[PDB]
Amino acid sequence: DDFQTHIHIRVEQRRGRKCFTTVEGIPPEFDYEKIMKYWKKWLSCNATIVEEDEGKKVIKLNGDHRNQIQQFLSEEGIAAVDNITIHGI
RNA sequence: GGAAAAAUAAGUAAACCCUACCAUUUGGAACAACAAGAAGUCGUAACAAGGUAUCUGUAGGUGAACCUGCAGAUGGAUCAUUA
Ligand SMILES: [Mg+2]
Ligand SMILES: [Mg+2]
Ligand SMILES: [Mg+2]
């Protein structure tokens, strides 16, 4: 019964020292399209919604604002502070 | 007959109040705003034709620098080619 929402925040190296923040685990409820926008202006970086495996929708922005995002999804509510994961090396 | 107090009207007009307006100073705050700086963060606009150019005006859009349409100017990557 994995109904709960488990959000994964990834941090990838896409070039020398340039990083990527990845957010996967956002319920389809609210379309990312509108979170793509806000996050772009929020952190000031380019976003992209990547969709691997037909159903799973992922937000892939450049940087490393995981600290921000978790603080964002929680403060907002779209994701309870507990269920949010920070896979950070 | 002179003549003190008192009282009188018009007058000069102190102060005071109300109604407008001027001048000179001085005041004010969270959030906001502005100023300056950097190997903060994201990208790369501009110089190099700096990915096939900048730039002016106006218009519209955009995380950001900016892109794009129409019209110009070279301060351009031409001072030049009917045989
Ligand atoms: Mg700077
Ligand atoms: Mg223009
Ligand atoms: Mg404009």
Side-chain angles (χ1 to χ4, degrees):
Chain A
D1 195 305
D2 284 306
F3 180 54
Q4 300 189 304
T5 323
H6 314 295
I7 284 185
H8 293 309
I9 283 176
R10 298 295 176 179
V11 160
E12 300 175 54
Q13 178 209 71
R14 275 288 225 176
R15 266 299 173 190
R17 197 196 141 200
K18 149 186 159 194
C19 306
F20 275 42
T21 303
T22 272
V23 180
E24 25 158 40
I26 304 148
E29 266 73 310
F30 11 57
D31 213 323
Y32 317 57
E33 304 176 58
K34 195 171 179 185
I35 282 68
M36 269 283 92
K37 192 175 189 179
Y38 187 65
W39 282 27
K40 284 187 164 188
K41 309 162 191 168
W42 179 235
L43 317 145
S44 311
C45 37
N46 218 299
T48 295
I49 301 180
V50 186
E51 193 175 62
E52 305 153 302
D53 306 322
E54 296 180 55
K56 304 171 185 179
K57 257 190 172 189
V58 175
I59 275 193
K60 190 194 199 186
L61 47 169
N62 344 297
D64 177 299
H65 328 283
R66 29 182 186 172
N67 348 288
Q68 314 278 53
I69 292 168
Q70 160 160 53
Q71 181 172 301
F72 165 62
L73 310 184
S74 64
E75 291 177 303
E76 258 308 84
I78 60 191
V81 195
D82 286 52
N83 307 323
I84 308 179
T85 312
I86 327 170
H87 298 286
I89 315 178

